[PDB]
């Protein structure tokens, strides 16, 4: 095990801010105990799991229903009833503050040709939405013939702290 | 080499990471390493590998006009598959739901299509791909209320209720 | 210097990680560079490591037969489509795993439920699976009818012990 | 010291030389347990799924019919997700996502894809897209529909500046 | 400070660190805190989603009808995403993504997949693909349509060189 001097200001700069140069010729095999030392891993797929208690289930027809309206990060997944882009029947996921509204998932998308018999399919969505104070995430159907369906849960608080399942 | 470290941040972390049985500096020599952690843990720790389906671990289901339990013991479960789409006004229901016998929540729903100008309603698969955590008393199930619709797919237990990974 | 550690969890993990038929911490922080990726042959990021090549690709297009995709131990990625049929159809197209005794379907085509019509339109039914085979296991594609197909590609991602196979 | 061995690997030697520019490599036979303080020392970056979240303030919402609509035209990284109205491959009705500098244009999501047979009654479905696009100076990301019958619908947001610095949600 | 009993670990170390002149492995009970400088040493890195972004300059756009069109034919890792025109599995109209070396060819995305029943009016939908392909010397990634009625549409870009070195967007 010997040392050689390094020429690199970036590494030197990086190290300085890390802990307020030379290299070794011997490669050391290691095992990393960091996760165990921290109290156990928080693998993302598990942390975001749906539970009976945490699931915000929704199935909206001819009404407007709030999915969430408290600050934080939310996963939202589901489907809309597709309609002709020329249709008046709206089934959307939207966010609003009572002043403006933005559609995050839109159903009025199909463009049939040569027929008035318009088949419909689910339009999927899978979104991560952050709400601040005064914001509402909602599902809106304006017509008895279309639905907005799915599930949501709060993934983190507004400060970005993860919420256990 | 060796210099002194001033970090409340690093000091506090190092002491939480490595608790002392009893009531900091840095080196200026960079050490090249190789990491054997994954092998030491038994291999196949990368998420895609660890979550793999096997003949032994696969909970296969294909549900028509009945209710079928996928899991009813605590843990984390991956569940993937399809439902038969129907009109949003149909009586033919195919769902994935979670329940404790008191509250029930649908996680995947088939009643979604909205045809116009026709009574000949075409159907497509409605996919789902879910991670569900069950605690004591919870059931994950597939349910079809009609011989004309199915809920089909596969599931497996990914981890125990405390998050410990289950190796396939 | 060094100091004794009181952590039952850390002690247990270290015992498990580095088994021996036979605990402290340091206060000096060591800067490192990690050569593991190069030592493994490079291109270890998951998207690169799992790439398909002309040589490694198990291509399949199965009609009215059973075709083995893999039958040796390891982890396999398998992706593709089935021909959708009515949920009451006799025309079956599946991905399944079997040991010659038990068989489980991993992807199923018999899913659509038309109403008010006998003219049944069909779409691809996609699948994207990670399957681990052990000794004696076969992953296969099967179509029982000339009208339906199982199409796709697969490759071996790792050996049965989890060691990655580079493309 | 625990027993060491000479490592014979040009790739590892060359890599170490580029990493740590001014060797005869050796390896050690003792496995050392470590804990990593890098994240603690660095700042503690936000998990990607959270960092990329859509908000009422940050979302570039679009619903485009018979017009060309800019999604972004300043440098940076943008996530753009949504759907196009499918049409027959021989259709004249175009609904696309495209990037352009005014000299050339590339379609990143194309709607004219279906190939019906045995019928002139052509059903349509959404054609989804989910893209990460980097714009440099002079580039425009846009949604374009050339006809009242087809739409481009979706959302976008700026994920990072052109230097790769992440933007908070 | 202690002997390790693990053939799996010993074999792994031996593979990682080759030695022509090739012993008991050992472990230490002293946990060492580290910081990882690798990213800075490599010149810096970008998060994967940003690194893989499409740009006007890097995008290989294709819209293929009744011809064979090369997407890439030099070594490297390529992301390729897009759609094929679906047809009946019994159709003669082919739209595929394939890889070839001029002797062997394999289809990576296939359009002839639908199985209508009780009708000769066969509706078509996009068949999506999203692939990572590694080409070595002599390999070609291509889109092929054998009929004017079917298309292969999409975008691709080179993600890394053949050794895995990442290409900046
Ligand atoms: Na209704
Ligand atoms: Na039935
Ligand atoms: Na056939
Ligand atoms: Na219109």
Describe this structure in words.
The structure is a homopentamer. Chain A contains three helices and 13 strands. With 165 residues, the first copy, chain A, is mostly beta strands. Chain A has two domains: 31 residues, Double Stranded RNA Binding Domain (Other non-globular), CATH 6.20.250; 134 residues, Jelly Rolls (Sandwich). Chain A has a four-stranded antiparallel β-sheet with strand order 4-13-6-11, with no helix packed on it. The first copy, chain A, has a four-stranded antiparallel β-sheet with strand order 5-12-8-9, with no helix packed on it. In chain A, strand 8 and strand 9 form a beta hairpin. The longest helix of chain A is centred in the first third of the chain and has 10 residues. Chains in contact: A-B, A-C, A-D, A-E, B-C, B-D, B-E, C-D, C-E, D-E. The interface between C and E is large, with 66 and 63 residues. Strand 3 of chain A pairs parallel with strand 3 of chain D. The complex binds sodium ion (NA) (4 copies). The site of one sodium ion has 3 residues of chain B, from loops.
Entry summary:
It is classed as viral protein. The structure is a homopentamer. Chain A has 165 residues and is mostly beta strands.
Main sheet attributes: strand count, strand direction, barrel closure of chain A = 4 strands, antiparallel
Ends distance of chain A? 48 Å
Query: Which topology of the largest domain in chain A does CATH recognise?
Result: Jelly Rolls
Q: Helices and strands of chain A, in N-to-C order? A: EHEEHHEEEEEEEEEE
- Quaternary arrangement of the chains shown? homopentamer
